[PDB]
């Protein structure tokens, strides 16, 4: 309750290292805030008696400094190491900088050091004496150099070591094997290199090992089988090569395994195909090969499977619907040279599916099957079914479908009306096909649709008026997409768009487009459009991109469109237009090919 005087000196030193005052602390000698540091915010005290200090003069001792998200700036003063009873130092998510005093890593009573999300820099101190530390958390800072080779010399109680999102380099020190009690080890997102020292596989209590985003190389040792408590293993984005070891019977707690973007080859180990515990599996972007085999009686926890962008061949496994928890499958860039199995009509757990660029044949059969997966919300068929016909068979219904992408298939046919059976559609991409006919008016009736890519087809006739009444354009999970490659994490990462470009469309642009106030992107380029440009286009308040180029448009560019305050890209190029322009800031390539 009454602040120890030596702790006050120490906290005073701590304040001196800061750029700005902490509210509630007595920052200067002026008796406004109380002088008792135990009264201050972020400071917790315990009596000297309860800490087992036998001093005749009792006092409250500072046991906890909890400063998270305080906008603290400046260095971490060497004086903090003068708080000899400090158990918890939590400075997470502040603006702090400078290097770390070796004195801090000398505190005998410290349980928790959380410096995460700051700007700290320099070498990490090589001598670390923290006999009481449970938690070493430096995640997201600017530290560089070798990980201290002596790191585990004195850390007898260590549970969590998080060095992730820093600049550390070199190999994982062989001494890492002496952190016997460690449960969480993150090294992820550093500069680390070389092979994993065999010594790491001695850490028997390890439940989370995160190595992703480094330069680590060599093989993945069969000694991995020794880390028997592993829940989560992430080796993604490294230089690892060879085969994935067959040790997954031994890791029976492993629910998360990500090896993606490595050099792995060979078949998936059969034990992984039998793993009872595995929930998230991502092997994508390797050289893995063979027939894909999954034992669905065994893998009852499997919820997400990403084998994409691998060297596998053979058929699409027909037993997959029997993995009854499996909700998401990314099978893209596996060259099946096959049809989707009929059993897929029974895959009722499936919510997300991508066969993109997988050599799938017979879109007719494929869709007649997949319509029966009642929970399917997203489907990616891009780059398959080359030159085939997009079936108009009316009996097709994808009821819960949110996202439908079949692009760059060169598909013949028209926009099929059975798509109106997907009333909750958010994203539709039919682009880069051979599609013909007119653009169906019922598209305007889809109240959740914010993204429509019809571009690069043979479409003729008018722009349907209903598009100007599109509700989501008028008014206000993991398996990412790439746009042709820029990554988008979910459907809503795509800004609302109408792309009708590279068709034969005719008629004019409707004034009612000005009703679409949530539209970010309108691309009408390379059509046969005629008439004027409505002044009502000034009504689309969210418009960023408007490309009318390569059309037959005439008249004046309405000065009113100057009212579009977010408009970042504008092209009227290669039309026939005349008169003044309101906007001096758009390049000439935007106005060129007009006369006037």
């Amino acid at each position: 309750l009454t602040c120890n005087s030596n702790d006050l000196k120490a906290l005073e030193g701590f304040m001196r290292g800061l750029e700005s005052s902490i509210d509630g602390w007595k920052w200067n000698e002026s008796s406004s805030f109380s002088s008792n540091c135990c009264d201050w915010v972020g400071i917790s005290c315990k009596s000297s008696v309860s800490l087992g200090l036998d001093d005749v003069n009792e006092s409250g001792r500072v046991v906890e400094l909890e400063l998270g998200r305080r906008k603290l700036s400046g260095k971490l003063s060497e004086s903090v190491a003068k708080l000899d009873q400090l158990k918890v130092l939590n400075l997470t998510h502040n603006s702090l900088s400078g290097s770390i005093a070796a004195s801090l890593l000398n505190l005998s009573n410290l349980e928790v050091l959380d410096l995460s999300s700051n700007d700290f820099s320099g070498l990490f101190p090589s001598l670390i004496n923290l006999p009481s530390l449970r938690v070493l958390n430096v995640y997201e800072n600017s530290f560089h150099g070798l990980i201290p080779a002596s790191l585990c010399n004195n850390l007898p109680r260590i549970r969590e070591i998080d060095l992730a999102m820093n600049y550390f380099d070199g190999s994982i020190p062989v001494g890492i094997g002496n952190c016997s009690s460690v449960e969480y080890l993150g090294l992820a997102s550093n500069n680390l290199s070389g092979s994993i020292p065999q010594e790491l596989f001695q850490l028997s209590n390890l439940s989370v090992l995160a190595l992703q985003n480094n330069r680590l190389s060599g093989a993945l040792s069969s000694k991995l089988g020794k880390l028997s408590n592993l829940g989560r293993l992430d080796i993604s984005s490294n230089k690892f090569s060879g085969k994935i070891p067959d040790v997954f019977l031994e890791l029976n707690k492993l629910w998360y395994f990500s090896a993606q973007s490595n050099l792995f080859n060979g078949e998936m180990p059969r034990s992984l195909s039998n793993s009872r515990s595995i929930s998230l599996l991502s092997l994508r972007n390797n050289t893995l090969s063979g027939q894909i085999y999954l034992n669905c009686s065994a893998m009852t926890n499997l919820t997400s499977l990403d084998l994409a962008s691998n060297s596998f061949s053979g058929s699409i496994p027909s037993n997959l619907p029997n993995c009854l928890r499996l909700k998401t499958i990314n099978f893209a860039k596996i060259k099946f040279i096959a049809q989707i199995p009929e059993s897929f009509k029974n895959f009722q757990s499936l919510t997300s599916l991508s066969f993109s660029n997988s050599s799938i044949q017979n879109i007719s059969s494929a869709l007649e099957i997949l319509q029966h997966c009642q929970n399917l919300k997203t489907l990616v068929l891009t780059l398959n079914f080359q030159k085939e016909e997009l079936p108009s068979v009316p009996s097709l219904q994808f009821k819960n479908l949110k996202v439908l992408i079949i692009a760059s298939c060169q598909l013949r046919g028209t926009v099929p009306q059975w798509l109106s059976n997907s009333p909750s559609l958010q994203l539709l991409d039919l682009s880069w096909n051979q599609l013909s006919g007119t653009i169906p008016p019922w598209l305007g009736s889809l109240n959740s649709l914010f993204y429509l890519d019809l571009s690069n087809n043979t479409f003729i006739g008018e722009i349907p008026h209903s598009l100007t009444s599109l509700q989501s354009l008028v008014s206000k999970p993991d398996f990412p997409f790439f746009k042709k490659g820029l990554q988008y994490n979910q459907p809503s990462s795509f800004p609302p768009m109408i792309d009708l470009s590279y068709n034969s469309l005719n008629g004019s642009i409707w004034p009612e487009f000005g009703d679409l106030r949530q539209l970010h992107v309108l691309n009408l380029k390379n059509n046969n459009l005629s008439g004027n440009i409505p002044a009502n286009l000034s009504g689309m308040t969210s418009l960023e991109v408007l490309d009318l180029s390569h059309n037959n448009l005439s008249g004046n560019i309405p000065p009113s469109l100057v009212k579009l305050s977010f408009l970042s890209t504008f092209s009227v190029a290669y039309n026939k237009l005349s008169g003044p322009i309101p906007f001096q800031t758009f390049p000439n390539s935007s106005f060129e090919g007009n006369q006037g």
Partner: peptide, 5 residues
Amino acid sequence: YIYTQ
């Protein structure tokens, strides 16, 4: 267009 990988 959109693909996955």
